[PDB]
C-alpha cells in the first residue's frame with residue numbers, strides 16, 4: 001500500500017521534473033488517485049512504470065505520461081462540464097473529477113468495463129464520476145454542451161457529434177488515424193472563428209468502435 005504509493009510518488013515527481021505534469025492541478029489529481037487503484041491486482045506492481053497496462057476485455061489503461069499530457073492540454077478548471085469517451089478502468093475519469101470538482105460524464109461501450117470502472121471508482125470513494133454504457137462516438141446529448149471532450153480511443157476521423165456537443169471556445173482531444181491502433185493526437189478547438197487543430201504527435205490507443213468511429 002504505502003509502498004505502492006511511494007513508487008507512485010516517484011513517478012509523479014519524475015513526470016513533474018521532466019515537464020510532463022505542468023500544473024499543480026494535474027499534480028494534485030495524480031497524487032490523490034494513483035494508477036494502482038484502477039488496475040487488476042496482478043498489474044498493481046507495475047502501475048508506477050510509465051507504460052500502458054492491460055485491463056479487462058482486451059483493452060488497456062494508457063501510460064501515465066500520456067494521461068498527463070492529455071489532461072494538461074485540456075486546461076481543466078473547477079466547474080467545467082467534461083465528457084470522457086472511453087472509460088476503461090475509470091482512472092482518467094477519477095483524475096478529471098478531482099480537477100473539476102463536479103459531475104463528470106464518461107462513456108464505455110463494453111459492459112464488463114462499465115462494471116469494472118464503477119467498482120474501481122466506488123472502492124476509491126469517488127462519487128462525482130458517472131459511467132454510462134453506450135457508444136461514445138455519438139457523444140452524450142443529455143448533458144451537452146461540454147467545455148472539453150477527452151477521447152481515449154482512436155478514431156478514423158473527427159466524430160461530428162463530438163464537435164456539435166462542444167461549447168464555443170471548448171476543445172476536443174482525440175486520437176485520429178487511418179489505422180485502428182496507431183494514431184495522431186489531435187487537439188480540436190471549436191473557436192468563434194472555426195475549427196482550429198493542433199497535432200500533438202503519434203500515439204497508440206485501442207480503437208474507438210461505433211457509429212462515428214470504426215465499424
Ligand SMILES: Nc1ncnc2c1ncn2[C@@H]1O[C@H](CO)[C@@H](O)[C@H]1O
Pocket residue numbers: 059060085086087088089107108109110113134135136137152153206207208209210213
Ligand atoms: N464508441 C465507444 N464509446 C465508449 N467507449 C469506447 C468506444 N469505443 C471504444 N471504447 C472504449 O475505450 C476505452 C479506452 O479507454 C476502452 O475500454 C474501449 O472499450
Ligand code: NA
Pocket residue numbers: 061062087088089090091092093
Ligand atoms: Na483511464
